[PDB]
C-alpha cells in the first residue's frame, strides 16, 4: 500500500538497509526484521529479498548463526559491537517463516529454522526455575541476576516457531515468558520497565543500569500481547494505565519506580499502540513527514497485528 511505499522511500536504501534516520542513520536487526515482516505483509518479494540479502551478507555472526545487531555506516568499523539482539534475530526468523508461506518457497523456511535453532541453543537459558531468552548472547548474564528485556518476548513469533519446529521448547518458552511477565510490574501503574533484573530466586526489579521507565522498548509489549491474543489477561495493566489518560494526553513514558511520567504525550506510532491496546478503531496507517523511523514502523506493525487477527 501507500504507507509501505512511503516507508521504503524514506528509510530503505538501495542496498537493502533500513535507516534509523533519527539515530544517526544506523541500521539494526530490529529494523531489518521489522521491514522484512512488512515486506511480506505488502507482498513485496523484491524488497524482502533485498532486505534479507543485506542482513545475511552483512550482519550474520558465523560463530553462532545469529546476527550482529547494529550497523553504523560512518564508523571506522561499521559492525564494532559483535553482540546480537535477540528480538532482532527473532523478527528476522519470523519474517522468513512468513515469507515461505506467502511465496511458497521452502528456502525461506530452511533459513528460519537455522536461526530459531540458534536462538534456542545460544540465547535461551534455565534460570529461576524457568526457560528465559537473554537479550543477547553476551553481557546480560550476571551471576545471580539476568538483565532481561520483556519487550524481546515476541509472543506471536514464538507461537509461529512452535508450529514449525521444536514445538515443546518454544511452547515452554512462551509459557514461561507469559508467567514471568505476569509477575513483573512496579509502582502505581503496575507496569514493567524497558529492562528488568531477574534474580536467581525469581525476584524481579527494574534493572539497575537503565532508567527504570516503561518507554520505547516496553511499549512493544502490549503490541506483541495483542498480536498473539487480544483477550490475554496480561493486557490488563496496559489497558488500565492507558484508560486513565485522555487519548491525546497519554504520557510517552512512565518511571515505574517513582511514578513520574513524561511531560509529553504519545503520538504517531506510540499512539497507534495505545489505540490497539484499548481496541479503539483506527484506519490503515499513513506515514507523515513527522514520523521518524520508529513511529513509521510501529504504525505499520500495529496495522499488521490487527490484520493477523483474521
Numbering used by the authors: 24 to 333
Recite the paper's sentences.
Here, we present the cloning, expression, purification, crystallization and X-ray diffraction analysis of a cellulase from the cellulolytic bacterium K. pneumoniae found in the gut of the Chinese bamboo rat. The gene encodes a protein of 310 amino-acid residues, including a signal-peptide segment (residues 1–23), and has a mature molecular weight of 35 kDa. However, Cel10 cellulase activity was more efficient on CMC than on Avicel and xylan, which indicates that it is an endoglucanese.
There is one molecule in the asymmetric unit and the final structure contains residues 24–333.
